[PDB]
Amino acid sequence: MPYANQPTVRITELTDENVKFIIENTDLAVANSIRRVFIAEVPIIAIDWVQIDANSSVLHDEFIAHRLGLIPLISDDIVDKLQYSRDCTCEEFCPECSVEFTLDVRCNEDQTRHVTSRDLISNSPRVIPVTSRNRDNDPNDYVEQDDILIVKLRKGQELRLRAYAKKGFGKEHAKWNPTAGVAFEYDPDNALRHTVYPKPEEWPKSEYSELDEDESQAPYDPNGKPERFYYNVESCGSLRPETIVLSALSGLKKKLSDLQTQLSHEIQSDVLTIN
Amino acid sequence: PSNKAFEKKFRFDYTNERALRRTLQEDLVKDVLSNAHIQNELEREFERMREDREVLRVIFPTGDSKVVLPCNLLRMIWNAQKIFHINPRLPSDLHPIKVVE
């Protein structure tokens, strides 16, 4: 339609972790809905079935199962071709809808052993390993760098289990969050008066509020509308930041186009003559 | 309070003070100013009001006007005025005897 503006983007900054950008000339409802997709709708792989062969550790089993689900997983190369479990024709699991992990550790040593993310092995090809320590010429590598201490073991304890990771999205459980956090900010100088400051001098100025380097603090304009939203998406590490954004928009496109097909389905099946 | 004040606010005068009497407020009632019977019946009404005022002073010696009663007649008059679109500056259209009976 003629009244659609088609927005604008600017990437301010990009790292292996963060992606920080500005969206301009669009609606808040778009900005807010797109921020919500970054959390909930972007799909990923995380452990979903844990089968415990032997567990002599001082942590109870369901605790091991909890810590273990929550650990992060690379998915970028494979999260797309993977299908959803319920949709897949197979009974239980298969190579085509899930990937398998195996963990086997025993404390035969006199010193306390730690159980870590590297000790967890993918029966699936090393296309989808755990996040830490793989093709890592990584300056983030410090001391142990176990990514997670699944448990500690004293001389005699042992741990054997199987796990099946599956594709799903954050609306269903928090283990599937593809974000470390999501900053969102709009109209930093409070031109539009969406908040009303009592004694405005008592508030600090963000890094976006510099435009009024002065201390005049918030010049008013009532003919304005919300424009130019600032973002900073931050990667949990399990999916690189730009891929989070591109997959979010596509998923949102997929969800919208589908609602259009059902709305079409109303005009095709049960001919739209009710109203 | 004040017997004189009660008399002033409640009594329907007939001597008609030169204030467009009979044609101010009321409409055709200027035509029933010559009625003897209507004068005696309202004068009878005012006679009941002095006697009621006397009994009511015996019932509530303390002098409180707050009593529990049904309907709330005053709010109803307001509901009545508001709906029929009654303009209080426009002249009346009501016969006093219709009211008393």
Partner: protein
């Protein structure tokens, strides 16, 4: 009982930063600087680690991990 994978409030993974922290405190008495080097910016992620108590260490010491 051992530091949780991912901070409650937001999600930033945090168990990985525990072993690193005991090393920094041994080196320096700068809890401010220690938390900073680990990258724990915002304080929700910071309370997580700053307020943890590693009970596991006393717990492991019983001889019978066998029952």
């Amino acid at each position: 009982m051992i530091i949780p994978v991912r901070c409650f409030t937001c999600g930033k993974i945090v168990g990985n930063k525990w072993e690193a922290y005991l090393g920094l405190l041994q080196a320096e008495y700068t809890e401010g600087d220690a938390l900073d080097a680990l990258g724990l910016k915002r304080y929700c992620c910071r309370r997580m680690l700053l307020a943890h108590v590693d009970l596991i260490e006393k717990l492991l010491n019983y001889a019978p991990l066998e029952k």
